[PDB]
Amino acid sequence: TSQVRQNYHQDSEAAINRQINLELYASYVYLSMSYYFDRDDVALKNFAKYFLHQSHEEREHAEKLMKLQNQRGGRIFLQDIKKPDCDDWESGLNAMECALHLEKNVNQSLLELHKLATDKNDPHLCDFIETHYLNEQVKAIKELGDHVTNLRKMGAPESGLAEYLFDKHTLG
Which of the residues 60 through 119 are near Cl ion (CB under 5 A)?
Answer: none
| Residue (16 or 156) nearer to Mg ion, CB | 16
| 119 interface partner picked from Cl ion, Mg ion, its own copies, none, CB below 5 to 8 A per type | none
CB of 128 to its own copies, least distance (A): 7
- The response to whether 137 counts as a known ligand-binding position is yes
The count of residues in the chain is: 172
Should residue 120 be labelled a site residue for its own copies when binding is judged by CB under 8 A? Answer: no
| 58 interface partner picked from its own copies, Cl ion, Mg ion, none, CB below 5 to 8 A per type | Mg ion
> Distance between CA 156 and CA 21 in Å, rounded?
33
Instruction: Provide the 10 A C-beta neighbour count for residue 96.
Output: 28
- The response to whether 58 counts as a known ligand-binding position is yes
| 10 interface partner picked from Mg ion, its own copies, Cl ion, none, CB below 5 to 8 A per type | Cl ion
User: If 0-12 CB within 10 Å is exposed, 13-18 middle and 19+ buried, where does residue 109 land?
Assistant: middle
List the one residue from 23, 115, 120, 171 that touches its own copies (CB under 8 A).
Answer: 115
- The response to whether 163 counts as a known ligand-binding position is no
Angle at 135 between CA 139 and CA 149, to 5 degrees: 20
Should residue 172 be labelled a site residue for Cl ion when binding is judged by CB under 5 A? Answer: no
For 42, residues 6+ apart whose C-beta sits below 8 A from its C-beta are 36
Four-residue CA torsion sign, 54, 97, 143, 171: positive
Should residue 120 be labelled a site residue for Cl ion when binding is judged by CB under 5 A? Answer: no
Instruction: Provide the 10 A C-beta neighbour count for residue 140.
Output: 20
Should residue 60 be labelled a site residue for its own copies when binding is judged by CB under 8 A? Answer: no
Q: Which amino acid is at 154?
A: M
For Mg ion, the binding residues (CB under 5 A) are 23, 58, 61
Contacting positions for Cl ion (CB under 5 A)? 9-10, 153, 159-161
